[PDB]
Coordinates of C-alpha atoms in Angstrom, one line a residue:
Chain A
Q1046 CA 108.4 120.7 86.8
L1047 CA 108.5 122.1 90.1
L1048 CA 109.8 118.4 91.4
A1049 CA 112.3 117.9 88.5
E1050 CA 113.5 121.8 89.1
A1051 CA 114.0 121.1 93.0
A1052 CA 115.6 117.6 92.8
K1053 CA 118.5 119.6 91.2
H1054 CA 119.8 120.9 94.6
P1055 CA 120.5 118.0 97.1
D1056 CA 122.5 120.3 99.0
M1057 CA 119.5 122.1 100.6
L1058 CA 116.1 120.1 99.8
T1059 CA 116.1 116.3 100.9
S1060 CA 113.0 113.9 100.4
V1061 CA 111.0 116.7 98.6
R1062 CA 107.9 114.5 97.9
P1063 CA 104.3 115.1 96.9
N1064 CA 101.0 114.6 99.2
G1065 CA 98.5 112.6 97.4
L1066 CA 97.6 109.7 95.0
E1067 CA 98.7 110.7 91.4
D1068 CA 96.3 109.2 89.0
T1069 CA 94.6 105.8 88.4
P1070 CA 93.2 103.9 85.2
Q1071 CA 89.4 103.5 85.6
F1072 CA 87.0 100.6 84.1
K1073 CA 83.9 101.8 82.4
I1074 CA 80.7 99.3 82.1
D1075 CA 78.5 100.7 79.0
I1076 CA 75.1 99.3 79.5
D1077 CA 73.2 99.3 76.3
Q1078 CA 69.6 100.1 77.8
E1079 CA 68.2 100.0 74.3
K1080 CA 69.1 96.1 73.7
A1081 CA 68.6 95.6 77.4
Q1082 CA 64.9 96.9 77.3
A1083 CA 64.6 94.9 73.9
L1084 CA 65.5 91.6 75.5
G1085 CA 63.1 92.1 78.4
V1086 CA 65.3 92.9 81.3
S1087 CA 64.4 96.2 83.4
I1088 CA 67.1 98.8 84.3
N1089 CA 66.7 98.6 87.9
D1090 CA 67.3 95.0 88.2
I1091 CA 70.5 95.3 86.1
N1092 CA 71.5 98.3 88.5
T1093 CA 71.1 96.4 91.7
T1094 CA 72.4 93.2 90.6
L1095 CA 76.0 95.0 89.4
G1096 CA 75.7 97.2 92.8
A1097 CA 75.2 94.2 95.1
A1098 CA 77.3 91.7 93.2
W1099 CA 80.3 94.1 93.0
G1100 CA 80.0 97.1 95.4
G1101 CA 78.4 95.5 98.0
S1102 CA 74.9 96.5 99.7
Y1103 CA 74.2 97.4 103.2
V1104 CA 71.0 95.2 104.0
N1105 CA 69.9 95.3 107.5
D1106 CA 71.1 94.9 111.3
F1107 CA 71.3 91.8 113.6
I1108 CA 72.2 91.5 117.3
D1109 CA 75.2 89.4 118.0
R1110 CA 76.3 88.6 121.5
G1111 CA 74.0 91.4 122.6
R1112 CA 75.5 93.8 120.1
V1113 CA 74.2 95.1 116.9
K1114 CA 76.1 94.5 113.8
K1115 CA 75.5 94.9 110.0
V1116 CA 74.8 92.3 107.3
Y1117 CA 76.5 92.7 104.1
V1118 CA 75.8 91.0 100.8
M1119 CA 78.7 90.9 98.3
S1120 CA 80.0 88.6 95.5
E1121 CA 82.5 85.7 96.7
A1122 CA 86.0 87.1 95.6
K1123 CA 86.4 84.9 92.6
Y1124 CA 83.8 86.4 90.4
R1125 CA 84.7 89.8 90.8
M1126 CA 88.6 90.2 90.0
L1127 CA 88.9 90.5 86.3
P1128 CA 86.6 92.3 83.5
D1129 CA 85.8 88.9 81.9
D1130 CA 84.2 87.8 85.3
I1131 CA 81.3 90.5 84.3
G1132 CA 80.1 87.5 81.8
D1133 CA 79.6 85.3 84.6
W1134 CA 76.7 87.3 86.0
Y1135 CA 73.2 86.6 85.0
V1136 CA 69.9 88.7 85.1
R1137 CA 66.2 87.4 85.1
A1138 CA 64.2 88.7 82.2
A1139 CA 60.3 89.5 82.4
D1140 CA 59.2 86.1 81.1
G1141 CA 61.5 84.2 83.8
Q1142 CA 64.3 83.3 81.2
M1143 CA 67.8 84.4 82.6
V1144 CA 70.0 86.3 80.1
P1145 CA 73.8 86.8 80.8
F1146 CA 75.4 90.3 81.3
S1147 CA 77.6 90.0 78.4
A1148 CA 74.7 89.9 75.7
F1149 CA 74.3 93.7 76.4
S1150 CA 77.2 95.0 78.0
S1151 CA 80.7 96.7 76.8
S1152 CA 84.0 97.7 78.7
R1153 CA 86.0 100.6 78.3
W1154 CA 89.2 101.9 80.0
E1155 CA 89.8 105.4 80.9
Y1156 CA 91.8 107.6 83.1
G1157 CA 91.0 109.5 86.1
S1158 CA 92.4 110.9 89.5
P1159 CA 91.9 109.1 92.8
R1160 CA 92.0 112.0 95.3
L1161 CA 91.2 115.9 94.5
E1162 CA 92.7 118.4 96.8
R1163 CA 91.5 122.0 97.4
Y1164 CA 93.1 124.8 99.2
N1165 CA 91.2 128.1 100.2
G1166 CA 88.4 127.0 97.4
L1167 CA 90.9 127.0 94.4
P1168 CA 92.0 123.6 93.0
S1169 CA 95.7 122.7 94.7
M1170 CA 98.2 120.2 95.1
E1171 CA 100.5 119.8 98.0
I1172 CA 104.0 118.9 98.6
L1173 CA 106.4 118.2 101.3
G1174 CA 110.0 118.1 102.0
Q1175 CA 112.7 118.5 104.7
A1176 CA 115.7 120.7 104.9
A1177 CA 119.2 119.4 104.2
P1178 CA 121.6 118.4 107.1
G1179 CA 123.4 121.5 108.3
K1180 CA 120.5 123.9 107.0
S1181 CA 117.5 125.7 108.4
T1182 CA 114.2 125.4 107.1
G1183 CA 114.1 129.3 106.7
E1184 CA 116.8 128.7 104.0
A1185 CA 114.8 126.0 102.5
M1186 CA 111.4 128.1 102.2
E1187 CA 113.5 131.0 100.4
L1188 CA 115.0 128.5 98.1
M1189 CA 111.7 127.2 97.1
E1190 CA 110.1 130.6 97.1
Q1191 CA 112.7 131.7 94.5
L1192 CA 112.1 128.3 92.6
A1193 CA 108.2 128.9 92.5
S1194 CA 108.4 132.1 90.6
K1195 CA 109.5 130.6 87.1
Chain B
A253 CA 48.8 105.3 156.2
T254 CA 51.6 102.5 156.0
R255 CA 50.3 101.0 159.2
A256 CA 46.5 100.9 157.8
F257 CA 47.8 99.8 154.3
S258 CA 49.7 96.7 155.3
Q259 CA 46.5 94.7 155.8
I260 CA 45.4 95.3 152.0
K261 CA 45.7 91.9 150.1
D262 CA 46.9 91.4 146.7
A263 CA 48.6 94.8 146.8
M264 CA 52.1 96.0 147.9
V265 CA 51.5 100.0 148.7
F266 CA 53.7 102.1 150.6
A267 CA 53.4 105.9 151.5
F268 CA 56.4 108.6 152.1
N269 CA 57.4 112.2 152.1
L270 CA 59.2 114.0 149.3
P271 CA 62.8 114.6 149.7
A272 CA 64.2 117.9 150.8
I273 CA 64.8 118.9 147.3
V274 CA 63.0 117.0 144.6
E275 CA 65.6 117.5 141.8
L276 CA 68.0 114.6 142.7
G277 CA 67.7 111.4 144.6
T278 CA 67.9 110.9 148.1
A279 CA 71.8 111.3 149.7
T280 CA 71.1 108.6 152.0
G281 CA 72.7 105.2 150.9
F282 CA 74.5 103.7 147.9
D283 CA 73.5 103.2 144.4
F284 CA 75.3 100.2 143.2
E285 CA 75.4 99.2 139.7
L286 CA 76.4 95.5 138.5
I287 CA 77.5 95.5 135.0
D288 CA 77.9 92.6 132.3
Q289 CA 81.5 93.2 130.8
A290 CA 81.4 89.8 128.5
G291 CA 78.3 89.3 127.1
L292 CA 76.7 86.7 129.5
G293 CA 72.9 87.7 129.0
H294 CA 70.0 88.9 131.0
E295 CA 69.7 85.3 132.8
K296 CA 73.4 85.2 133.9
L297 CA 73.1 88.9 135.2
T298 CA 70.1 88.4 137.2
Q299 CA 71.5 85.2 138.9
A300 CA 74.6 87.2 139.7
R301 CA 72.3 89.9 141.1
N302 CA 70.6 87.2 143.1
Chain C
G1213 CA 129.3 144.3 112.3
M1214 CA 125.9 143.6 114.3
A1215 CA 123.9 144.3 111.0
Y1216 CA 126.0 142.0 108.8
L1217 CA 125.8 139.3 111.5
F1218 CA 121.9 139.7 111.8
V1219 CA 121.7 139.5 108.1
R1220 CA 123.9 136.5 107.9
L1221 CA 121.9 134.7 110.5
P1222 CA 119.7 132.0 108.9
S1223 CA 115.8 131.9 110.2
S1224 CA 113.7 129.2 111.4
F1225 CA 110.6 128.7 113.6
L1226 CA 111.4 125.8 116.3
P1227 CA 113.8 123.1 116.8
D1228 CA 113.1 119.5 116.6
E1229 CA 113.9 117.2 119.4
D1230 CA 114.3 113.4 119.7
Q1231 CA 110.9 111.8 120.9
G1232 CA 111.5 108.1 120.7
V1233 CA 109.0 107.9 118.0
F1234 CA 109.1 108.2 113.9
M1235 CA 107.2 107.4 111.0
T1236 CA 107.9 105.9 107.8
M1237 CA 105.2 106.3 104.7
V1238 CA 105.2 104.1 101.7
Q1239 CA 103.6 104.5 98.3
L1240 CA 103.3 102.2 95.5
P1241 CA 102.8 102.7 91.8
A1242 CA 99.3 103.6 91.1
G1243 CA 97.2 100.3 90.3
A1244 CA 99.2 98.4 93.0
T1245 CA 97.1 95.9 95.1
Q1246 CA 97.6 94.8 98.7
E1247 CA 99.9 92.1 98.5
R1248 CA 102.7 94.0 96.7
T1249 CA 102.2 96.9 99.6
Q1250 CA 102.5 94.0 102.3
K1251 CA 105.5 92.8 100.6
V1252 CA 106.9 96.3 100.4
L1253 CA 105.9 96.9 104.2
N1254 CA 107.4 93.1 105.3
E1255 CA 110.8 94.5 103.7
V1256 CA 110.8 97.7 105.7
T1257 CA 109.9 95.9 109.0
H1258 CA 112.3 93.2 108.3
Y1259 CA 114.8 95.9 108.0
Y1260 CA 114.1 97.9 110.7
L1261 CA 114.2 94.9 113.3
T1262 CA 117.2 93.4 111.8
Chain D
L504 CA 63.8 82.2 98.7
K505 CA 61.6 80.0 96.9
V506 CA 58.9 77.6 98.3
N507 CA 56.7 75.7 95.9
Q508 CA 53.0 74.4 96.7
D509 CA 54.7 70.8 97.3
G510 CA 57.5 71.3 99.9
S511 CA 60.4 72.3 97.6
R512 CA 62.7 74.7 98.8
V513 CA 65.6 76.9 98.2
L514 CA 67.6 77.9 101.5
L515 CA 70.0 80.5 101.6
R516 CA 73.3 78.1 102.3
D517 CA 72.7 76.7 98.9
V518 CA 73.0 79.9 96.9
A519 CA 75.7 81.9 99.5
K520 CA 78.5 81.0 102.1
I521 CA 77.3 83.1 104.9
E522 CA 79.9 83.8 107.7
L523 CA 81.0 86.0 110.0
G524 CA 83.4 88.7 108.5
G525 CA 84.8 92.1 108.7
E526 CA 82.8 95.3 107.9
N527 CA 85.7 96.2 105.4
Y528 CA 89.0 94.6 104.8
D529 CA 90.9 97.8 103.4
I530 CA 92.8 98.4 106.5
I531 CA 95.1 95.6 108.0
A532 CA 97.9 95.9 110.9
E533 CA 100.8 93.9 111.9
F534 CA 102.8 94.5 115.2
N535 CA 106.4 93.1 114.9
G536 CA 105.4 90.8 112.1
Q537 CA 102.5 89.4 114.1
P538 CA 98.8 90.0 113.2
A539 CA 97.4 92.7 115.6
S540 CA 94.7 95.4 115.9
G541 CA 95.0 98.8 117.0
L542 CA 93.2 101.6 118.3
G543 CA 94.5 105.1 117.5
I544 CA 93.8 108.2 119.8
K545 CA 93.5 112.1 119.0
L546 CA 93.5 114.6 121.5
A547 CA 90.4 116.9 121.5
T548 CA 91.1 120.6 120.8
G549 CA 92.1 121.7 124.5
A550 CA 92.9 119.4 127.0
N551 CA 95.7 118.0 129.0
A552 CA 97.6 114.9 127.3
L553 CA 99.1 113.7 130.6
Chain E
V1129 CA 53.8 108.7 86.4
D1130 CA 55.6 106.6 84.0
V1131 CA 57.5 109.6 82.9
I1132 CA 58.5 110.3 86.6
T1133 CA 59.5 106.2 87.1
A1134 CA 61.6 106.4 83.8
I1135 CA 63.3 109.5 84.9
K1136 CA 63.8 108.1 88.5
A1137 CA 65.2 104.8 86.8
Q1138 CA 67.6 106.1 84.0
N1139 CA 68.9 109.2 85.7
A1140 CA 70.5 107.6 89.2
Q1141 CA 74.1 106.7 90.2
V1142 CA 74.9 103.2 91.2
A1143 CA 78.0 102.2 93.4
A1144 CA 79.6 99.9 90.9
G1145 CA 82.3 98.8 93.3
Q1146 CA 86.1 98.3 92.6
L1147 CA 87.9 95.9 90.4
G1148 CA 89.9 93.6 92.5
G1149 CA 87.8 93.6 95.5
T1150 CA 88.7 94.6 99.2
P1151 CA 89.2 90.7 100.1
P1152 CA 91.5 89.8 97.4
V1153 CA 91.9 86.1 96.2
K1154 CA 95.6 84.8 96.2
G1155 CA 97.6 86.2 93.6
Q1156 CA 95.9 89.2 92.3
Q1157 CA 97.6 92.4 90.8
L1158 CA 95.1 94.5 89.3
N1159 CA 93.1 97.1 90.8
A1160 CA 90.7 99.8 89.6
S1161 CA 87.5 101.4 90.1
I1162 CA 84.5 100.6 88.0
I1163 CA 82.5 103.6 86.7
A1164 CA 78.8 102.4 85.9
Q1165 CA 75.8 104.6 84.9
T1166 CA 75.9 108.2 86.2
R1167 CA 73.7 111.0 86.1
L1168 CA 72.8 112.6 82.6
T1169 CA 74.6 115.8 81.6
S1170 CA 72.8 117.2 78.7
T1171 CA 69.5 118.3 77.0
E1172 CA 70.3 115.7 74.3
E1173 CA 70.8 112.9 76.7
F1174 CA 67.7 113.5 78.7
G1175 CA 65.7 113.7 75.2
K1176 CA 67.1 110.0 74.5
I1177 CA 65.3 108.5 77.9
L1178 CA 63.4 105.4 77.0
Chain F
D1204 CA 80.2 70.8 94.0
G1205 CA 82.9 71.6 91.5
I1206 CA 84.0 68.0 90.8
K1207 CA 85.1 67.0 87.6
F1208 CA 83.1 64.2 85.9
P1209 CA 85.0 61.0 85.3
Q1210 CA 83.8 60.6 81.6
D1211 CA 84.3 62.8 78.7
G1212 CA 82.0 63.5 76.0
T1213 CA 81.6 65.0 72.5
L1214 CA 79.9 68.1 71.0
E1215 CA 77.5 68.0 68.0
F1216 CA 76.0 71.2 66.7
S1217 CA 72.3 71.3 66.9
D1218 CA 71.1 74.8 66.8
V1219 CA 72.0 78.0 64.8
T1220 CA 69.3 80.3 65.5
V1221 CA 69.4 82.8 68.1
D1222 CA 67.0 83.3 70.8
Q1223 CA 65.0 86.6 71.0
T1224 CA 64.7 87.2 74.6
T1225 CA 67.8 85.8 75.6
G1226 CA 70.5 86.6 72.7
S1227 CA 72.3 83.1 73.2
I1228 CA 72.8 80.0 71.0
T1229 CA 72.4 76.4 72.4
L1230 CA 75.0 74.2 71.8
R1231 CA 74.5 70.6 72.3
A1232 CA 76.8 67.7 73.5
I1233 CA 76.5 64.0 74.1
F1234 CA 77.6 62.2 77.3
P1235 CA 78.3 58.4 78.3
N1236 CA 76.3 57.7 81.5
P1237 CA 76.7 54.2 82.4
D1238 CA 76.8 54.7 86.0
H1239 CA 73.7 56.7 85.8
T1240 CA 75.5 59.6 88.1
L1241 CA 73.5 62.2 86.6
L1242 CA 69.7 62.7 86.1
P1243 CA 68.0 64.3 83.3
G1244 CA 67.3 68.0 84.2
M1245 CA 70.1 69.1 86.5
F1246 CA 72.5 71.8 86.3
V1247 CA 76.1 71.4 85.1
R1248 CA 79.1 73.5 83.8
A1249 CA 80.5 72.5 80.8
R1250 CA 84.0 73.3 79.7
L1251 CA 84.7 73.4 75.8
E1252 CA 87.8 73.4 74.0
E1253 CA 89.0 75.8 71.5
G1254 CA 92.8 75.4 70.4
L1255 CA 96.5 76.6 71.4
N1256 CA 98.1 79.3 69.4
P1257 CA 101.8 80.1 70.1
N1258 CA 101.3 83.4 68.9
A1259 CA 100.9 84.7 72.5
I1260 CA 102.4 87.5 74.6
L1261 CA 102.1 87.6 78.0
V1262 CA 103.0 90.5 80.0
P1263 CA 102.6 91.0 83.7
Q1264 CA 100.0 93.2 84.8
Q1265 CA 101.7 95.8 86.8
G1266 CA 104.1 96.7 84.0
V1267 CA 100.8 97.9 81.5
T1268 CA 99.9 101.6 82.0
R1269 CA 96.9 103.4 80.1
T1270 CA 97.2 106.7 78.7
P1271 CA 94.5 109.2 79.1
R1272 CA 92.9 108.4 75.9
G1273 CA 92.3 105.1 76.8
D1274 CA 95.0 102.8 74.9
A1275 CA 97.7 101.0 76.8
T1276 CA 101.2 101.7 76.9
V1277 CA 104.3 99.7 78.3
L1278 CA 107.8 100.9 79.2
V1279 CA 110.3 99.3 77.0
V1280 CA 114.2 99.6 77.3
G1281 CA 116.4 99.8 74.0
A1282 CA 119.8 98.6 72.9
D1283 CA 121.4 101.5 74.3
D1284 CA 119.8 101.0 77.8
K1285 CA 117.5 103.9 77.3
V1286 CA 113.9 103.6 78.2
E1287 CA 110.9 104.2 75.7
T1288 CA 107.2 104.3 75.7
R1289 CA 105.6 101.7 73.3
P1290 CA 101.8 101.7 72.8
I1291 CA 100.2 98.2 72.6
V1292 CA 96.9 96.8 72.4
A1293 CA 95.9 94.8 75.4
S1294 CA 92.6 92.7 74.7
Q1295 CA 92.4 90.0 77.4
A1296 CA 93.7 89.4 80.9
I1297 CA 94.3 85.7 81.9
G1298 CA 95.4 85.2 85.5
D1299 CA 97.4 88.2 86.3
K1300 CA 99.1 88.6 82.8
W1301 CA 97.9 91.0 79.9
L1302 CA 97.7 89.1 76.3

């Protein structure tokens, strides 16, 4: 509402923009621990497999040309690009047979925010702007102060 | 002691006096430091020092 | 007249001066990938250099 | 990764594509259109810029 | 010890990663965050630990 | 290695029961192997065929957003050039397009 109201005075306020990402959809993987335990797999194996395949897990260090650099383990691009790719991963059961990840999992889309800002403890959101040519920043501050008291 | 110790076999032994202030090194001479800035390794560094 | 002109004069804090460098910020729609941002930045740099 | 008692083995290169890459690919840089890298430098709290 | 192990295993947070990973395949346009198992937030949820 | 097999086979259903510790069904297919290019017991990836269906609407991914509830919406434009929000149902994503 403040941005919409401030867009109505181009003669004083120019390039009035927010500072931060707005909102993004998020993906939620529902693991049915009941079915997973009934089949024979363990929750630790499922969690480690998902985290290492899609998130990447820092494992160890190794020397390279007289310098210590880390070794990472992560899936190879093609298999972690779409939700349906979650069906390509398999987990070893208790008796050694391998069960697909799609026999005990579900997918759901939700909403969320990527960045949260707080000023002086209380939640807050920050915007920026510049005064119009031929004007002074004090007049812009006054105009925004009088616009904020609604 | 140095004169009487040079005749000892299977040992390089020396004797000396502590500097005037034993908190920093002796102010005589220079302390050069060869540095590897390309990743040559220990063997190349020793060869260059030699 | 002094009082009226003092009231009239606008206020600020510090003048802005040319420094030879400035910045450009690009924000794409939420959920955008790296390729679209690269295309937008390519457009921006091509315009700036042409 | 798996060796039975007859010599049969499962090596890492049969499962993976081990190669030298970057720690994270989130940030890319381009100088005048060509690929490039960069080091940004912030002055500490209290010092002479020159 | 069984209860302790079950609580430790079923009340943890896992870094699921990100849809459309950091190195993208040529032609990607979707990117989002994966929200996997999270910490339990109620007594009724703690009572359902297997 | 990913190389497509030169010959093609057919599918004959053999098993209808569901495994208890795998939750999976085992389909069966036959393959002519005159050159003995595949030994018994190795691992292969079989691609099946289901059928085409021209009741298909493909929408580019960057045009579809999601409401806080969870359902998906898109931005349409009307006859009077006025934009509107139309909720839709996005089930599958193929390539870079929602179906």
